[PDB]
Amino acid sequence: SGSGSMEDFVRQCFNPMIVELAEKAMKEYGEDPKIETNKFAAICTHLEVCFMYSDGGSKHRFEIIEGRDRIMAWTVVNSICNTTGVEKPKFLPDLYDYKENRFIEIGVTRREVHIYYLEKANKIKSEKTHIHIFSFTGEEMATKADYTLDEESRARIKTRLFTIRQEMASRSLWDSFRQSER
Numbered sequence: 001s002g003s004g005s006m007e008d009f010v011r012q013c014f015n016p017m018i019v020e021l022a023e024k025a026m027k028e029y030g031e032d033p034k035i036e037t038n039k040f041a042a043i044c045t046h047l048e049v050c051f052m053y054s055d056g057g058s059k060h061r062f063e064i065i066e067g068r069d070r071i072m073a074w075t076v077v078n079s080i081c082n083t084t085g086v087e088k089p090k091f092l093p094d095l096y097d098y099k100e101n102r103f104i105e106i107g108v109t110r111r112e113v114h115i116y117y118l119e120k121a122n123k124i125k126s127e128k129t130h131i132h133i134f135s136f137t138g139e140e141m142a143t144k145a146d147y148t149l150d151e152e153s154r155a156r157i158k159t160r161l162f163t164i165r166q167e168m169a170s171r172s173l174w175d176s177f178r179q180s181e182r
């Protein structure tokens with residue numbers, strides 16, 4: 001699903017650390033980034049958003065969980081759960097917010113935001129993990145309308161996603177990418 005031109009886009013658009021992590025994640029489930037080029041882009045976009053989000057607040061406001069190998073990710077999670085007393089989640093979240101003492105699940109979707117927010121709530125069971133969804137169109141949605149970051153940090157994620165959409169569109173990759181979400 002997708003072109004070799006989309007592979008070229010991914011390698012040009014995203015920094016090498018994100019690209020390496022994405023290639024590893026895909027190969028871990030027996031998929032080839034040179035074939036599932038759309039999924040390649042989507043994974044890179046989610047990783048980038050998670051990292052941008054973590055740089056959004058104060059110094060070390062957030063611990064990053066996404067992008068870590070599974071042992072280190074759960075080490076981080078178990079340590080925080082042990083230290084703050086918050087409930088152990090059933091699945092790895094993406095961040096932990098020290099200010100608000102909650103885990104965060106980040107979603108990035110090419111579909112409608114309410115649909116994805118609801119899918120996340122169904123998978124999540126923690127009932128205390130906070131969900132924040134972004135789209136490429138500018139939509140944005142969070143649990144209890146609590147958007148965690150200030151407007152300037154969020155606008156800037158939203159702008160980055162916009163930019164990605166536009167550059168894809170100029171390359172005639174957007175339609176394929178848009179429809180490819182599962």
Ligand SMILES: O=C(NCc1ccc(O)cc1)c1cc(O)c(=O)c2c(O)c(O)ccc2c1
Pocket residue numbers: 025026027029031039046066092093094105106107108
């Ligand atoms: O599906 C996941 N892994 C398996 C897999 C990887 C690569 C492939 O090519 C095919 C399957 C996965 C794992 C995760 O740890 C997440 O953490 C995750 C996430 O935050 C999200 O906001 C959205 C999806 C997420 C999805």
Ligand SMILES: [Mg+2]
Pocket residue numbers: 066092093094
């Ligand atoms: Mg994650």
Ligand SMILES: [Mn+2]
Pocket residue numbers: 046094105106107
């Ligand atoms: Mn996520």
